[PDB]
Symmetry: none
Subunit: 106 residues, 3 copies
């Protein structure tokens, strides 16, 4: 998926998932070179739900979660994964929506 916002602006991405995933850890990360991606925020694991300009909120009742990036900078752009964390060692084998972030001039 592709999403775009202006520098200084904000963006949110909604990522859907299936009913059995309601209670699983939900996360946001860049695609890794190792099995585990470096989770920027997550709903249940140790990254925390908020880290600086990035936050994550799960809405099981709608079968989706939303990642929000505040005060965008050019560095925020790029490929990300929004994932639901399943038993697999590698996050690649989770249900993942790939999200491509663009950041344009304000």
């Amino acid at each position: 998926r592709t999403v775009a916002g202006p520098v200084g602006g904000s963006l949110s991405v909604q990522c859907p998932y299936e009913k059995e995933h309601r209670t699983l850890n939900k996360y946001w990360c860049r695609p890794p070179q190792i099995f585990l991606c470096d989770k920027i925020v997550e709903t249940k694991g140790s990254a925390g739900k908020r880290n600086g300009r990035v936050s994550i909120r799960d809405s099981p009742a709608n079968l989706s979660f939303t990642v929000t990036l505040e005060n965008l900078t050019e560095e925020d752009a790029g490929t990300y994964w929004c994932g639901v964390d399943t038993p697999w060692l590698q996050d690649f084998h989770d249900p993942v929506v790939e999200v491509e972030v663009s950041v344009f001039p304000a």
Copy 2:
């Protein structure tokens, strides 16, 4: 996931998988390293279902398979992979569930 048992005792470990994997070879292997992980037991592969004190049994109805260790020894402890042998290209290799096996004193 960690499963543990006493020296001389037994344990079994469950390894979940996806519906797509029901018909695939399942395995149990040590070291957790791609290519170097040697399959101790497999459900279809030539390692066989039982290799000494270890066996494997698949239950596609519960989307998991179970590895059993008997007569545990200290050397049985370590990190293992429960693996699904997927016959297609994967950028991060076969899907695996990582299991820490621990052995505690025999009571």
Copy 3:
């Protein structure tokens, strides 16, 4: 594991429900205060030497519904506290993460 609080009145028959997943279906299901060291003292269990019924405690597995139930009769203040809705391999004493960590509160 998952966390559940189960509350009921003193002298009541308290019904603790412990859901689980498909991988746990065939496992022994148990009730116990969490382990002092490695393993807990199984109060009741569905597939073990402990028995499904002992004193005011009894257990019933409902694998079709991916849940088991522990019933506490004649609930007292001393019953409050932390417990494991535990799982292990039938007829043996191995360590698995419990499926539910239960807090019993008595009012």
